[PDB]
């Protein structure tokens, strides 16, 4: 009913557990009453904390393999992981959502 830091903390644990069980990210979003970009923001929070996740099962199903390869190469060769920088370089070809997803994979693989 009202967000608290404890329920936010528990939600993130839940999202991780769902990702481990290979639940589709869009299904996870619905399960928590989130829009897709809101879910991406939680997953980014999770990844920033150093939590090891793996969303290949989802990326491989929904994304164009060439888009994935080219966005990933951009991150491999980049100096900063910044989304703003990635949009400046890649935004003429790829959406924010594609770039955010591959960025999650890239940061998670550190």
Binding site for its own copies (CB under 8 A): 47-50, 77-82, 85, 107-108, 110
Instruction: Pick what 94 binds: its own copies, Cl ion, Na ion, none; C-beta below 5 to 8 Å, kind-dependent.
Output: Na ion
Q: How far is the CB of 110 from its own copies (least distance, A)?
A: 6
Q: How far is the CB of 45 from its own copies (least distance, A)?
A: 10
Q: How far is the CB of 30 from its own copies (least distance, A)?
A: 27
Query: Given candidates 2, 6, 21, 79, which one binds Cl ion under the rule CB under 5 A?
Result: 79
Instruction: Pick what 2 binds: its own copies, Cl ion, Na ion, none; C-beta below 5 to 8 Å, kind-dependent.
Output: none
What do you get for the CA distance between the two ends of the chain, in Å? 36
Long-range contacts of 105-108 (CB under 8 A, 24+ apart): 105/55, 105/56, 105/59, 105/72, 106/72, 106/75, 106/76, 106/81, 107/47, 107/48, 107/81, 108/47, 108/52, 108/53, 108/54, 108/55
Where on the chain is the footprint of Na ion (CB under 5 A)?
Answer: 94
């Amino acid at each position: 009913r009202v967000r608290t830091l404890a329920n936010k903390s528990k939600m993130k644990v839940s999202i991780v557990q769902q990702i481990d069980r290979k639940v589709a990210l869009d299904d996870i979003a619905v399960s928590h009453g989130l829009d897709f970009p809101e879910l991406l923001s939680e997953v980014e929070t999770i990844v920033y904390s150093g939590t090891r996740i793996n969303i290949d099962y989802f990326i491989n199903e929904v994304m164009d393999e060439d888009h994935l390869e080219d966005i990933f190469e951009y991150f491999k060769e980049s100096t900063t992981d910044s989304l703003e920088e990635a949009m400046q370089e890649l935004g003429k070809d790829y959406s924010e959502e594609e770039i955010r997803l591959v960025r999650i994979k890239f940061l998670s693989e550190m």
